[PDB]
Design a protein around this ligand. Structure first.
Ligand SMILES: CN(C)[C@@H]1C(=O)C(C(N)=O)=C(O)C2=C(O)c3c(cc4cccc(O)c4c3O)C[C@H]21
Lengths: 112, 112
């Protein structure tokens, strides 16, 4: 969604510490895989964008949801979220567990 | 811009540690209170979205840029960037200097 779309009620920013660019590419490919297609159809899901840090040491997911309740009761309650968490957090090359920060959009500066 | 617009070549995620929700509100209010009106017309600036962490301890900015070159040359190299930093650090309730992570969008999941 546009970053300041009013439908975006909740945002998760998840950071995965990796040992380098080869692992960053694998992590992204696995996360945006094809078998993660079910996420697209979860009620309340708006977007998940994976980024590689410029220094090769981290992959960051910025994800937009309609609400915290949608994220917790529709994605979190689904058995596939536990499956995906296991898979991503056990890929070889990870230097620690993913760290998530949950947050609400409160203001935005955009060009006119 | 849409999170997966291909024009987004460079992203900065800046985390401001704060002492609770009241400071969260005051910092977003400051950041969107006109101190950075000038940024809207900077070439290559796409957006700056400020969010309050749900735990009350940080304000996070997700900022989209057309390229790292536009960010460094049209933002970082402009003396007004430093004035903006100084304005945001002068607020009571900040608990440390802001932390930045620089990154490139590499994959996305959108709805359907
Ligand atoms: C490893 N998986 C990928 C991982 C793990 O471990 C944690 C965690 N253990 O704290 C986490 O919070 C994740 C998280 O919040 C995720 C995970 C993927 C994921 C995918 C799409 C949207 C979205 O919002 C989201 C997400 O929030 C990946 C998570």
């Amino acid at each position: 969604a546009e970053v300041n779309d009013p439908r975006v009620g909740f945002v998760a920013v998840v950071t995965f510490p990796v040992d380098g660019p080869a692992t960053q590419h694998k992590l992204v490919e696995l996360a945006t895989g094809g078998v993660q297609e079910w996420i697209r159809e979860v009620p309340g899901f708006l977007s998940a964008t994976y980024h590689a840090s410029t220094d090769g040491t981290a992959v960051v997911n910025y994800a937009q949801w309609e609400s915290e309740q949608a994220y917790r009761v529709n994605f979190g309650a689904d058995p596939r979220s536990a499956e995906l968490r296991e898979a991503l957090s056990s890929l070889p090359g990870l230097m620690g567990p993913p760290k998530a920060v949950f947050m609400t959009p409160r203001g935005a500066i955009l060009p006119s």
